[PDB]
Write a protein that binds this ligand. Structure first.
Ligand SMILES: O=c1ccn([C@@H]2O[C@H](CO)[C@@H](O)[C@H](F)[C@H]2O)c(=O)[nH]1
Ligand SMILES: O=c1ccn([C@@H]2O[C@H](CO)[C@@H](O)[C@H](F)[C@H]2O)c(=O)[nH]1
Lengths: 810, 810
């Protein structure tokens, strides 16, 4: 049907239909008489999977023969979403499968909706890992993603009476056709026990053993016949475990709980024992696998030449002392040699500066669970602080600030400090964030070892986030500039030549309208909610957090409503305001924000005076599959974090690629996006980082803003008095109190500039042609934000390997 | 190679090799370079499974079209063993697969050893269910086995320092290629809650819900293209379950524990809540499935015309009040009508008369877990006792004896009484057992409803228990009489014509010697134990229990040892005495018996004066796969239960079919075996049932035997003094005390006759030709003991259906 979706050759279509029928019969044990749409999905998935196999086996054989340096990406989160369409895209099978299924009397898009998301992450950090795997395969790197196979991923969110409710994400219920269990490569992991000192070094004895069983999932590169591996570990009890009899068998659950469920916190540290077990479990199993693979290719001097380990945040930070443990206790290397190897092998990526997100583990937990690792951490600390003392003699404050051990009521280990000490490279995820690291939280470390500190601006994969989710836009672009941009996104710059092309202007606007119609129809079908497709689609989708300021958005919505009520007969640009995202189950304020949003909708959506000029919708169960639907439909992207709080953002990049304009602060990657597109082509407002610092120095007083801004005063009075909660007048008292007395994120301080900037947005939207021309200027300059660019920089500047766009033989 | 294993045609072999290679590549994602024997097993299993599929789909379609009466066999145990060879046998693929694998450079018998047993049973009762499924498919009945998919089957037994140790049977670790998950047919099961009475009947409300997810396994008939289904339920929590957050997800284990593990008790009732939950879980899910299937073919008058439910023991007895609950509470039938349907639908098989094995559930457990079922049971009891009172007016003792409710310290429900009241047929499992039921424990019920009581003598499948485990014997038989006997075992009578045939005598003896050599080699390979293949193989394999009298066997072994030590230079027929079987983890005496056996071996096997004239071996981890190895190798089958205690036995039948002679009491099916073969061709000894009754009446005094039998006195003195436990002289004091003062099973009373009978065995073994002629007389008359005969009798006399040996189209 469309060119970027590949060829539908007679031979291929015939073969696909044959194998589809085979799987339905032999694999699913069904006939066409009793088969349901779910059976048809599975027959298609197995058919497409077959095409991955040959390439998967030969890629891994190729790495064995060539023995390139291997890259290991360690993460507690891989937010993968659905796999079927992505696999077809990367193998050039989309049109062929579409034709084959059509001839069998089936609608492929209907079958695609049956697949469960692999929701093994919380938000940005987990989704970055997923984009990275796609880019590493596309650039021909010998890369492996290592994580945990959670039985339950991020919870399914239901909205009941306007409140968030959580349901278990039982994503494996119907099976996972993509994974291959590898019980033969099961490895032991040790917990608890005690340290024994012998004539020849320390010994970790009397441990409890949990087995780590790997499941491998293929990761296809874009049309290069490369298929890499994501290996996820699942926890299993040993067979003599606890071995009255019945209870001992039932108690196997205790061991197997390690891989049961993803902790649903985003940008918030919860110091629970089970989470620490998960972190060690992934690190211990992965490192054994790494060392095994290295030996099968005596002398650890070459270890950093053949192995790179990337730590995604501090979650897998135990890799550092675990590597030391293995090299010193088991392989019998001297300390200094082991440390040299460890530092040259490991690198660390930081994703946030918010103090509450930083992992600081109580010493007493580490002492009980991982006694040998605590000893190693103490020794690392002693040697590191001896270097600091030598470099900055007499600076006793610096010694306390830089220590891995934090003194106080309870002693803690600062895992970020451990990561910096034991890594040869430390990076932030956008230029402003990397600069903040050097100037503030890691200033002391930067002064000691400046060479360690780097920037690697985040990116997103243009396969999932353009070709897959927005084929209409991909097609009109390919018509003008060909197909090479899909693996070389910088080529989108060629589109600047079409900014005054009346045909292209019309096509860009047509694609957006079709996307909006499709999404408007999706909402009525699946959720019974009515929206006007001619309105400006104003969208903020991301996890619910105070720093992201969904609350500032709420204030603007109420402002719009109040202005309409004051002058009902004045024209206003119609808007559909959509907000979605999950709140961590224990985060009270975030749960209250969700309730506020639905409560505003309850009033606004039913006021006959408003009509269809303003609608407020809460998008339930935001996740990767939903992002693929709403992003291509958006006109306006809300990226409104307080300056200095969002390290990069990646949702911002997805919206830019898909033809939405951005309203945002100069925060994270917003700064670089505006720089690429030109500030005239962005809607920038509010305090810069320096302005926030100035306000902190004299002290933030929210009352000042309330006193001087009459429109703001009205909203707070409405919230306090019960206007949005008639039956429970004091429902939002917590929100008002926080805004007025305890607001770390200065919502009121950016209110006036935000509202004025939103007026400028509405003004441009009244002029379709000039709106679309600005859109073209954004799409055309989005190239820097491909994760292919990001990964090429990691490869060259951290891992010491060269990317390759060359095909493996088919 | 051998004829009964079918054809190895060029087309078939080529096709099998092709599909083997396909599965290795696409299914297992391996290449020949890295594949292990386990990978090769799985490639073969998937290849053979493919051949089942077409027949499986078309059999089930055939039942849908023809709508025959359906038979539902409800059991908490299905002791299936391995599936690969059985499937090849029934599909006539054995020789073809052997050739195909040989051409690929693989040994098929080596691959067969990799498969785990499906050990979803304890012993006789569970294995009977397995033989029954095979026979029902072979006789073309529309039959379904329904049970529980235990994650852990019967424990693996290890012997450490002579003691039994238990290890979890993690049989699903590497996957199960035979099953197909059917998550789409998941059904809810209710627990706890309370009963509400409305204007229109009772309502069971406020329940906890557990989901039952089915897994289907194919059951092939012998070369008739019939493939029936065994459906096993697995427990799953609902997704809103317990839905702080992390704990609620982890607590899903509580619901899912229902299907976690098989209770390892054999002939012993343990009244634990989790076991009651398992019993209701299987009954509730199964009955919904039954009713669904019935409606898809309003009026329940025809229900018993289209449905038969067979209760394997009282374990699924809750089917009776559950059927009543559904018919009365949900379908709104009047009580009397519902009861008529229930009685005509249900039938009950009793497997033991031992009082400690009878299920008597505390009322307080049923009251909390199943409040509506308790109410229904009370109502059944009231109506039943009104019938008794009308038939036997004034007989107040009879009313207390027959009540379903047992009065006392704790009130209990007698599940056997419930089963008799609510079934149209009640059967014992051998003629003597069925007679004992009518004369003793169920006498009152027999007097009220004589027509209900039947006999169905047990049997074994000649596919698994001859063709599969003893192809050598199957072949020499087929050479003389053809292949028809495999599905018509009565044809073995034709072999009486060859009792004086010198060629056949030589061949029968040759097959036994080869079997003995193979097993002798197995023991050295897998267990490093040396045995003399020329010795008489004297075998007792079955679960360890006081009633089965492994202890009597022990007394004979010590007698033999003491006689040798007294006259070292006298000739004795050399014996290898092998005893194997598992003890329930909480059964102290059974565990002590295992220790005694190993302790005897420790002395006997290392006495240089004995030489290789006597060896005592404990066969570790007795299970179906081991039975298939040891039974064809046996010369002497020990079936020595106290008369009136072993309801039938089925191990006895397996030995008779495979060319062992039997030493046994007149107990269970031993009586019918001796009758078929002729008493001259059996080694019968000991008290009959009547003799046991006489001894009970005057009182059993073990001291009398000790006083009058000098050889018995010596053994007890040896046991007491520490002869078999030098380091722990009082180790066996419990055993001695029981034998002397508290022996319910009268071990001493049969000792003298047993020893004398064993002398007669040794005498015959000295004459190879006459030994073998007696063997031929046993094999030739084993036909009655085919489970095909048993199932034909159930079909005609209980279920009201006609068996069919006719092929379905291929
Ligand atoms: O706990 C966290 C901490 C940070 N992050 C995010 O990581 C993304 C990937 O670098 C960045 O784009 C965002 F700026 C950052 O908030 C999370 O998503 N969970
Ligand atoms: O709990 C029990 C009770 C009885 N049984 C057995 O059932 C077999 C099948 O009918 C019979 O051959 C045996 F006689 C009987 O002991 C068991 O194996 N477990």
């Amino acid at each position: 049907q469309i060119s970027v979706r590949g060829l539908a050759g007679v031979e291929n279509v015939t073969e696909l239909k044959k194998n589809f029928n085979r799987h339905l019969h032999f694999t699913l044990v069904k006939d066409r008489n009793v088969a349901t749409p779910r059976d048809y999905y599975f027959a298609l998935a197995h058919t497409v999977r077959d095409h991955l196999v040959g390439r998967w086996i030969r890629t891994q054989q190729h790495y064995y023969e060539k023995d390139p340096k291997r890259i290991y990406y360690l993460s507690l989160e891989f937010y993968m979403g659905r796999t079927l369409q992505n696999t077809m895209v990367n193998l050039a099978l989309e049109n062929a499968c579409d034709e084959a299924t059509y001839q069998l009397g089936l609608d492929m898009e209907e079958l695609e909706e049956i697949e469960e998301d692999a929701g093994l992450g919380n938000g940005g950090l987990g989704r970055l890992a997923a984009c990275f795997l796609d880019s590493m395969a596309t650039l021909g790197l010998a890369a492996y993603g290592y994580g945990i196979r959670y039985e339950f991923g991020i919870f399914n969110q239901k909205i009941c009476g306007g409140w968030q409710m959580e349901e278990a994400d039982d994503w494996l219920r119907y099976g996972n056709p993509w994974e291959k269990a590898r019980p033969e490569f099961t490895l032991p992991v040790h917990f608890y026990g005690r340290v024994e000192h012998t004539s020849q070094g320390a010994k970790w004895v009397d441990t409890q053993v949990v087995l780590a069983m790997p499941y491998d999932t293929p990761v296809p590169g874009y049309r290069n016949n490369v298929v890499n591996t994501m290996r996820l570990w699942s926890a299993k009890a040993p067979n003599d475990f606890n071995l009255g009899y019945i209870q001992a068998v039932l108690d196997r659950n205790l061991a197997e709980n390690i891989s049961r469920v993803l902790y649903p916190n985003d940008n918030f540290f919860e110091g629970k024992e089970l989470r620490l077990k998960q972190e060690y479990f992934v690190v211990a199993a992965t490192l054994q696998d790494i060392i095994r693979r290295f030996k099968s290719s005596t002398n650890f001097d070459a270890f950093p030449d053949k192995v790179a380990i990337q730590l995604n945040d501090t979650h897998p930070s135990l890799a550092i002392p675990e590597l030391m443990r293995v090299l010193v206790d088991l392989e019998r290397l001297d300390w200094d040699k082991a440390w040299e190897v460890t530092v040259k092998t490991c690198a660390y990526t930081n994703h946030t500066v918010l103090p509450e997100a930083l992992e600081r583990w109580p010493v007493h937990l580490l002492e009980t669970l991982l006694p040998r690792h605590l000893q190693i951490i103490y020794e690392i600390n002693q040697r590191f602080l001896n270097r600091v003392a030598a470099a900055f003699p007499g600076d006793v404050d610096r010694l306390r600030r830089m220590s891995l051990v934090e003194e106080g009521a309870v002693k803690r280990i600062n895992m970020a400090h451990l990561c910096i000490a034991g890594s040869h490279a430390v990076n932030g995820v956008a230029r402003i964030h990397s600069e903040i690291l050097k100037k503030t939280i890691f200033k002391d470390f930067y002064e000691l070892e400046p060479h360690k500190f780097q920037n690697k601006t985040n990116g997103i994969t243009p396969r999932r986030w353009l070709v897959l989710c927005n084929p209409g836009l991909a097609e009109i672009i390919a018509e003008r500039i060909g197909e090479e941009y899909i693996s070389d996104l910088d080529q989108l710059r060629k589109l600047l030549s079409y900014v005054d092309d009346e045909a292209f202007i019309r096509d860009v606007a047509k694609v957006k309208q079709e996307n909006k119609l499709k999404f408007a129809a999706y909402l009525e079908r699946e959720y019974k909610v009515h929206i006007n497709p001619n309105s400006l689609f104003d969208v903020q989708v991301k996890r619910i957090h105070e720093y992201k300021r969904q609350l500032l958005n709420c204030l603007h919505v109420i402002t719009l409503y109040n202005r309409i009520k004051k002058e009902p007969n004045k024209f206003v640009v119609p808007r559909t305001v959509m907000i979605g995202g999950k709140a961590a189950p224990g985060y009270h304020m975030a749960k209250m924000i969700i309730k506020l949003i639905t409560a505003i909708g309850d009033v606004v959506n039913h006021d006959p005076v408003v009509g269809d000029r303003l609608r407020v919708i809460f998008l339930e169960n935001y996740r990767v599959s939903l992002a693929e639907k709403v992003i291509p439909a958006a006109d306006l992207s809300e990226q409104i974090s307080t300056a200095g709080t969002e390290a990069s953002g990646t949702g911002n990049m997805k919206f830019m690629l898909n033809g939405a304009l951005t309203i945002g602060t100069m925060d994270g990657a917003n700064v670089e996006m505006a720089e690429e597109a030109g500030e005239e082509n962005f809607f920038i407002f509010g305090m810069r980082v320096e302005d926030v610092d100035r306000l902190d120095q004299r002290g933030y007083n929210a009352q000042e803003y309330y006193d001087r801004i009459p429109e703001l005063r009205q909203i707070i009075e409405q919230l306090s008095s019960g206007f949005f909660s008639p039956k429970q007048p004091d429902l939002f008292k917590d929100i008002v109190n926080m805004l007025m007395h305890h607001d770390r994120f200065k919502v009121f301080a950016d209110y006036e500039e935000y509202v004025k900037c939103q007026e400028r947005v509405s003004a441009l939207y009244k002029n379709p042609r000039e709106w679309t021309r600005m859109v073209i200027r954004n799409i055309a300059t989005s190239g820097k934000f491909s994760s292919d660019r990001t990964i090429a920089q990691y490869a060259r500047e951290i891992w010491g390997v060269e990317p390759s766009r060359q095909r493996l033989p088919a």
